[PDB]
């Protein structure tokens, strides 16, 4: 499978090709413009999205765990749904409504625990 | 500056100037250029980066892996290639085997990874 | 399901013994597997887990040094490499399915399948 | 090795009950506390996983519970049939992957 051909695929079908999409992320003075700004953007919203894995405490990785728990209120599956049957575009429809409140929760989540090492390191 | 100035030195007396070279990466169409320019330096250095992370190097100068080295891609000891051989005659050596090892070093952090993933869902 | 555990059955103290396990009417790559023994004598006791993909084995102390489990999804085949036989290992050694969970699936801690056991005298 | 004991008895038509004890590093904390039944000269058939579950295939007659570190397996409407070596195990956490007691005969009457 080449970019996107695990798009129809199963959620835990998929998760496996994450190199796949992410390598395709990166890669007359009105052309000019035009071409420069479409690279911009490009390094704009890769740069926000690796901001993002950065303050969710899981620079570095494609795949990370959290400790924020799963609420059954945004989405009340079980895993044998969600991975076997599920494809990603359709959970992201699922849960979009809520795509914001777990960012938020993530993010507390690593300053809690960023500030808990801090002062771990510290004794002795 | 000191950039490049281990470009002559071996191999296990370079690699200790990492920083020094890694500092050093970062009228409308004389802004064009210049824009052109620095985008592609910022390109060339996310890319880089990128492709550092999906090995599981980020943010890291030296970093060690799981691949075992082939004695197809250079069939030399480590007192030839750490104590005679510069950085440029090494990477003329293995040249035609960059994308092999790259593809190993892919595949062997998704491994990884995944591994970890399972490793955490015990208890 | 089968599991159908092979192996030679008799080896002396110091020596080395490789038992096998074929698995059907399942899809072997999707659950992970387990060795456990069952002294002649007494009651069952798990010595050795591997994961689903067999990246990840889990061994008992008392054979961490001396057991390997492996796992062969092309074949779906089991086998389990002992080093060092002691008399202490003589027992049934039976084939589990079950054992682990891998993370995107619910979890088990439990042992779904069982074979009939090979039976290893040292 | 979890505390199991050696043997239990009962006629049938009558309910049993098998316990185990372990601590609170096993049985305890982690909800993961199946058992199995060995008919002599068989390898062991799950009737009980996690704590209360039962796998398809296996009837109502047996169930099961814990409460502290204790573990039970109850049975109630006991045949002849039954006649096994019943068995504990748990997830004792990582390192300890699983802890197993002695087994309890079940003789009927």
């Known amino acids: 499978l080449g970019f996107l051909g695990a798009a129809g695929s199963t959620m835990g079908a998929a998760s496996m090709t994450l190199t796949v999409q992410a390598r395709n992320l990166l890669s007359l003075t009105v052309w000019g413009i035009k071409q420069l700004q479409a690279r911009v953007l490009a390094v704009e919203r890769y740069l926000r999205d690796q901001q993002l894995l950065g303050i969710w405490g899981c620079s570095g990785k494609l795949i990370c765990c959290t400790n924020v728990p799963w609420n059954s209120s945004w989405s009340n599956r079980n895993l044998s749904e969600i991975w076997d049957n599920m494809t990603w575009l359709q959970w992201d429809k699922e849960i979009s409504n809520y795509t914001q409140i777990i960012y938020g929760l993530l993010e507390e989540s690593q300053n809690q625990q960023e500030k808990n090492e801090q002062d771990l390191l510290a004794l002795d | 500056l000191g950039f490049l100035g281990a470009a002559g030195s071996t191999m296990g007396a370079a690699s200790m100037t990492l920083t020094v070279q890694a500092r050093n990466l970062l009228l409308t169409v004389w802004g064009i250029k210049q824009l052109q320019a620095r985008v592609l330096a910022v390109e060339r250095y996310l890319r880089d980066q990128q492709l550092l992370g999906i090995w599981g190097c980020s943010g890291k100068l030296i970093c060690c892996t799981n691949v075992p080295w082939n004695s197809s891609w250079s069939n030399r000891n480590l007192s030839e290639i750490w104590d005679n051989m510069t950085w440029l005659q090494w990477d003329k050596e293995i040249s035609n085997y960059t994308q092999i090892i790259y593809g190993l070093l892919e595949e062997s952090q998704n491994q990884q990874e995944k591994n970890e993933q399972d490793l955490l869902a015990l208890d | 399901v089968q599991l159908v555990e092979t192996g030679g059955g008799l080896v002396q103290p110091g020596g080395s013994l490789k038992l096998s396990c074929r698995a059907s009417?399942?899809?072997?790559?999707?659950?992970?597997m387990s060795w456990v023994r069952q002294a002649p004598g007494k009651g069952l006791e798990w010595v050795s887990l591997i994961n689903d993909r067999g990246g990840l084995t889990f061994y008992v102390d008392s054979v961490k040094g001396r057991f390997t489990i492996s796992r062969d999804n092309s074949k779906n085949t089991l086998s389990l490499q002992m080093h060092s036989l002691r008399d202490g290992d003589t027992a049934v050694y039976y084939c589990a399915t079950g054992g682990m969970s891998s993370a995107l699936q619910s979890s088990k801690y439990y042992f779904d399948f069982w074979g009939q056991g090979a039976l290893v005298t040292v | 090795a979890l505390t199991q004991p050696p043997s239990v008895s009962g006629s049938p038509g009558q309910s049993v009950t098998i316990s185990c004890t372990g601590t609170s590093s096993d049985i305890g904390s982690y909800n993961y506390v199946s058992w199995y039944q060995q008919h002599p000269g068989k390898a062991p058939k799950l009737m009980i996983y996690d704590v209360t579950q039962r796998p398809s295939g296996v009837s109502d007659r047996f169930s099961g519970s814990k409460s502290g570190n204790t573990a039970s397996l109850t049975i109630s409407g006991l045949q002849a049939d039954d006649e096994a070596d019943y068995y504990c195990?748990?997830?004792?956490?990582?390192?300890?992957?699983?802890?197993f007691g002695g087994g309890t005969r079940l003789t009927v009457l």
């Open positions: 195990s748990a997830y004792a956490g990582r390192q300890t992957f699983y802890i």
């Open positions: 009417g399942y899809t072997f790559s999707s659950f992970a």
